[PDB]
Design a protein around this ligand. Structure first.
Ligand SMILES: [Mn+2]
Ligand SMILES: [Mn+2]
Ligand SMILES: [Mn+2]
Lengths: 629, 629, 629
């Protein structure tokens, strides 16, 4: 009956026609011994040739059993498939080591008229610290898999009523696409109660030629709110503000505009939220929009030793499922079988229970960065954990090539790290030395790389954090322009269209091998210190010594030049980096001056920042930024 | 004629429809250059496309020639195949190194109406210390292999009349399945004279809904005997008791309830028993029920240096035939071509001649463990060797992941090792130092791992062995509950459903790399000794320092904590392990006290245990345990 | 016209139906991207699917260009193929390094009615020290290759009239097969003028049930000559004797009875003989009858430093073409592109010009071994070189596993080496130290391995060589029985059917790793010397310490035992090897005594042996051994 529909956790899904073979690996893994490729006539069905084997040990179709055991009331899961033809459904699970274990097989024989139903209940008891469940089909005669699903044994609790939030800024076409994809799958459509779009740009999504068609499918569920550029924080703050005040939605789902969606991902997230033992945040993972078979990360934490976000303990960035199948002996694939606990999830997909939003308050008024991490740490302090759910994903731009933490974002990275550190530290007193040491090493590296503007804006970052939580809030919007203004006067921050716009380099490039050798690193380091003590030659600021590609722009090469072009990470331009011994020393001294301030004033900072949390997170205070005159 | 049927050693067999591709490797190996997969219309026939090659150099279809040379009167074997279409049957053998040697080819041309018979006699002379024989088929036109077999040149001696024994304990569904599979193959059915089922559990196999249908196919050959839980020993003791007293079966075949059967396996075992040079025990091998293409072990011995069961000298655990074909250059596969001699076979499949059972007596009244090894050692002392026959296998649970020698089984492992050691030593006087040293190293390891209960029950194991063979017999049933009772008071033995039932750990986990480095092991060892000399902090017994996964729970990580949860091997729960310096030292001292007793009293033990063998193995004394008031 | 037939060097040939895929690699190499396997409807034609590529860079179908350049008058070779369908014939050659070079392509379009002729002349100029020529076919539409050949540009000189010689000894079935295969190919049949069969055994080939049918196809060309067992030398001596006296055949072709033939091989050999610059010996290569895709060796020389036959400088034994294609980057395959010069060819296939046989005389009356090497050295001293022709091969048993130079053959190996050394030395005076040192190292090794009989018969070998060339001739027949008689009294030479015929070993085996480690070899060596100085324990001659498999029977393991069974190389039995310090020392002293004799008397030996060559090689003196009373 529809008792099936109410207990559906995760549908077995298949690729769209014309899907590149790499991406198909996220869905199904076919034996190379098969006569022909399996064919997907719809997104929920599959035709398999006679005498063929297909494995559903895959990102989208395997069941992340250990996560369900850890966070939900589901004691068991039921696999249900409908099949025609003759063959066997084999059910497997893994230990947290990745070791595969055969659970049970079921021979079937069905026809189009009388299709076979194959059911398998798997208890979730043996998944304490990792493991997946999946099935394979090995055929006798040609087989059609008409449908498949992972089901709970009882209906989902609560009511499904999601407010989806999508902040957008000068990407009307991406936003229109996102709105369109939300209503593509009828089952996702039915559970969406509202779509809040804080439009923070000048190029409005409302003015896009395809907007009316996307807007029609949502009807009055859609609202667009014009506001100034308040970054991610202001965007998602608005979303949460609107959801609590102007809707009765039980779940708040943060999403993003520049995404591609696998709609079942939303239902998986929702299912985990509904079956949850206690209220919690449920997050989706990010697949790399530019390398679509690659998983960005299983989950992330905040490392408390230096208060810095990182990969969770047994997780590694950029896992290509086409090269490294889930069910494979290699070391990268085995890591995927551990249950990865997280401190927070990113806001490309993050479900927040209504009550939880109410109790915790709004995002901190940081512009970009650390706002998601803060909201995870805050939630945990209130006994609301976060789970990053494997197999529930969207496609989003990763820092795949195109990004570098040396531009204006570096200001926000440092400032907000400090704000959130002050807000959540809890650890011993002398623990801040770790964070400052971390920053010193990075500072000397920037100076070695001639990334002078970076250091300057990081000096402003420290000043702004030190000025307190009231100054932070007052510069929600003004902070960005002020960072640009500082950067304009540094040659290392002025992007030119091409190296060919400048005089041709004095020297041709020579391939320099990266020093792994212990003695050689020392030698390159000393050579760098020695050069940095000399007065720079001004002629190398008129004509660059080298044109350095991004991939070659490393400290060991850069710490011996007086002047060079360095290509930006996105490959779109170059900057003329220039050494000046007087400026370097001055920036270094200003940095050290600030480092000593941080470790002197950090305890005070914790007090004032924790005392300001009611204010920084109140809907009323946020109204002063969100709403105009 | 049926002169063929009487001399059949081993049928050429093929996979069931829908069999996973991995498992098919146990039967046939097909070239990837073939246009299509070979098709098995029945379990004894195969269709092969035109211009295709299939190799029968496989676990089930190759002939383990060296074993037949060593233990049977067969001077040669005849390969007989019936084929239609046109092609070549090529016959090969190996040297004990694995080197393949072409013996002879036979071109054939047959039709469905006039099928071709292809015969090849292979003398068993060149297989002194290893080697297999097999065939390949390379086709011209499409070929059907209608049947194939390895045959002796004369009828099998003796009469085939097997009593199959299956002890069962609270696994009625598995037992019913086993009973069902015994009658699946008509040729196995015909040679079964009785099926004895000692039902030792409370959930009776007789009460299972599918039992009547399984029981009908056996008729009056089946008998079920209710008795208390007397472990494996009591179970198999009952089987042997019933077979000798209440049947006239010439062969006794020990099996198990949680198995999957390849019925031809039984006939292979029987064939080797019948053609045997002199009476002997014939055992089957175990394929891993959870990784079905994996062989557990070629055979096992008792290493006399420390009296401990191990892999036979050139055998390695867990051989995956899908990754490592029999006929392949790699080092793991070459080992399979040596004739592996064994001291004993396990009781998942072990054929014992009626007369031999009569002369040797019953199993020793050990609860679990070492009873099979003892029966092999005992048989050898009477001039009855054991053979583990390759290609004759059942599927059974291996210690594949799910088992750990630290629970209640550790008591039985140590106690019974000592009993069997006392029973069979024969070696020099000072030889027991080896066994005690072995136990000391294990003891210190348990204490390092905080596995305190293990040490305590191993202390009881030594006491029970020391009390003598009469005490051993008197605690056949009572020993198990008494072990549980000791374990209840150790935190390291109380299983909780999840780490989440306890307060969250103080520290997050950090990946610790296993020390292979020589200096680093020393450093980790010293760090462990140093920590173990400090007084433990009681707060770490309230709140665990870490949640440690099974795979990470190693001595180098565990010897530096005061308190931590460790997940059980099966992944079903966790235990709160807790360091206490006073308890550790006390357990260690109690262990050392016992170690010194062992090497002082071992000679005495041999005398009293050897003198008690008539008693411990008599059917009359066993009646006091097997039969009620 | 038949001007084509007269200039044919080497036909393009294809496998028989049902040929194992490995062996097919000797003929054709097909791309795995092809839809279907190529099909050979006859041995000289091939069907190739549409859009497919087949390479004829193979043992049998590529042209060994450098050999033809070196030894024949052919300035160029013409490739001629007849094809239907549409595609391209691509012609390639290699440098001696293996580097492939594209020469020329030819698009064709033919039909069954109007087949396309594709011709390509390749000049042999760039093959000074290596290189092959071959073709590939890449198809557009389905293609049939109807025929292909490598042709000279002018008719073959001389007259083709071969006397084939096949000595046989108790292998009537193999001999009958050889006779049968000689007439299988009409083109080989036509050039055979006689078949001489010295039947040296008691089981006569004449008495074989299939002999009359084989004999009918040869008619009066076949003659069988009964004589005593005079080994290989007597056999081939008889062949040459009969060919010169009783036929007018222009070529003498030594073959063997236990062979499989690729008939075109004979024509290739004949073609090279006819086109030769000057008269020469043309030999065929040996493919491994037991591993049929493996080449035994490209060619062999006599290393003058110690006067011992070996692989030619850049040749390595046992080249598997299925694993290592001719046209492949790997190091083993690149060696195949050098022109390998030889000192001699073996007598499995060796063509000798009539005049050359006349001038050189008969084989030396050695029983087995070194007779072929001598005949090559002798021929070279008369300005008649030997060529081993790649791509011209028979299948013959290699020393693939089944042979060990420790039995009765060791006597002949040493004695004949000395005879041929005395006959051909030429080098400096002090050069014999090398040969004696070589023998000392081998002697100490035999004694270390307990191979005592070997040393004793090698002591007789030296004595027999020292007694002179007249004694050698007088013991042509009697030498074999006399070697057996010596060996009967050594336990290490008495073969027993199985280790199980002896008392069971004292110790089980333990895997000993082969010492590659520099210090460890030293340690094992010292341990061996130390043990060999002790008095052996007689009880270890009653009951063996170990049962040692052939593969494990190495000096480092064997030099520490007093008594052990060692399995024979063929796996058919075992010998009880026994250490005795008194016997060892006595044999060693007798060996050293002889070693000092050799280096004192070697100059004398050269004189007497060279002076006896007219006698040892005269047909008249050979009549005293070949013909009865
Ligand atoms: Mn985005
Ligand atoms: Mn069991
Ligand atoms: Mn031969």
């Amino acid at each position: 009956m529809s008792e099936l529909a109410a207990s559906l956790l995760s549908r077995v899904i298949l690729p769209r026609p014309g899907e590149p073979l790499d991406v198909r690996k996220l869905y199904l893994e076919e034996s190379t011994t098969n006569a022909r490729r399996a064919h997907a006539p719809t997104r929920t069905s599959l035709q398999i040739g006679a005498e063929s084997e297909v494995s559903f040990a895959t990102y989208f179709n395997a069941f992340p059993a250990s996560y369900w055991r850890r966070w939900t009331t589901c004691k068991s899961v039921v696999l249900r498939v409908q099949v025609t033809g003759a063959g066997r459904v084999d059910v497997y699970r893994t230990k947290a080591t990745g070791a595969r274990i055969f659970v049970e097989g079921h021979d079937f024989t069905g026809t189009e008229d009388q299709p076979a139903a194959v059911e398998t209940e798997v208890v979730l008891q043996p998944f304490e610290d990792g493991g997946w469940v999946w099935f394979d089909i090995t055929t006798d005669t040609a087989v059609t898999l008409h449908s498949g699903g992972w089901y709970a044994t009882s209906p989902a609790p609560g009511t499904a009523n999601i407010a989806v939030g999508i902040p957008t800024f000068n990407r009307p076409a991406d936003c229109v696409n996102a709105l369109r994809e939300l209503t593509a799958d009828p089952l996702v459509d039915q559970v969406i109660g509202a779509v809040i779009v804080p439009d923070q740009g000048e190029r409005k999504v409302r003015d896009h030629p395809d907007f009316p068609a996307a807007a029609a499918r949502l009807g009055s569920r859609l609202s667009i709110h014009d506001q100034p550029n308040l970054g991610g924080s202001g965007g998602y703050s608005r979303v949460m503000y609107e959801a609590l005040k102007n809707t009765d939605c039980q779940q708040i789902l943060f999403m993003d505009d520049d995404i591609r969606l696998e709609p079942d991902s939303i239902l998986r997230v929702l299912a985990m939220h509904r079956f949850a033992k206690a209220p919690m945040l449920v997050g989706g993972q990010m697949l790399n929009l530019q390398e679509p078979s690659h998983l960005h990360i299983m989950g992330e934490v905040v490392d408390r030793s230096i208060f810095m976000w990182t990969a969770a303990p047994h997780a590694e960035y950029d896992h290509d499922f086409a090269e490294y199948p889930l069910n494979d002996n290699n070391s990268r694939s085995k890591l995927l079988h551990r249950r990865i606990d997280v401190d927070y999830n990113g806001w490309w997909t993050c479900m927040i229970p209504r009550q939880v939003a109410e109790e915790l308050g709004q995002p901190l008024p940081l512009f970009i960065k650390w706002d998601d991490a803060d909201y995870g740490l805050r939630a945990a302090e209130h006994g609301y954990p976060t789970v990053t759910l494997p197999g529930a994903a969207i496609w989003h731009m990763a820092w795949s090539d195109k990004d570098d933490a040396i531009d204006w974002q570096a200001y926000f990275h440092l400032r907000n790290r400090l704000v959130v550190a002050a807000m959540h530290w809890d650890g011993p007193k002398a623990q801040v030395i770790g964070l400052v040491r971390s920053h010193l090493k990075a500072t000397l590296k920037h100076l070695a790389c001639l990334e002078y503007s970076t250091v300057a804006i990081q000096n402003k970052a420290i000043d702004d954090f030190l000025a307190g939580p009231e100054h932070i809030f007052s510069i929600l919007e003004s902070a960005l322009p002020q960072v640009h203004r500082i950067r304009k006067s540094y040659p290392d921050a002025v992007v030119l269209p091409a190296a060919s716009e400048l005089p041709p380099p004095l020297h041709k490039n020579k391939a320099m091998k990266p020093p792994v050798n212990p003695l050689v690193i020392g030698y390159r380091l000393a050579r760098g210190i020695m050069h940095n003590l000399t007065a720079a030659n001004p002629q190398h600021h008129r004509r660059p010594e080298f044109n350095v590609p991004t991939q070659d722009a490393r400290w060991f090469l850069l710490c011996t030049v007086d002047g060079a072009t360095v290509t930006t990470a996105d490959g779109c331009g170059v900057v003329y980096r220039q050494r000046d011994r007087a400026k370097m020393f001055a920036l270094l001294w200003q940095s050290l001056r600030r480092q000593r301030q941080l470790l002197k004033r950090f305890e005070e900072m914790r007090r004032i920042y924790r005392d300001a949390l009611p204010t920084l997170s109140s809907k009323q205070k946020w109204e002063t930024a969100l709403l105009p005159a």
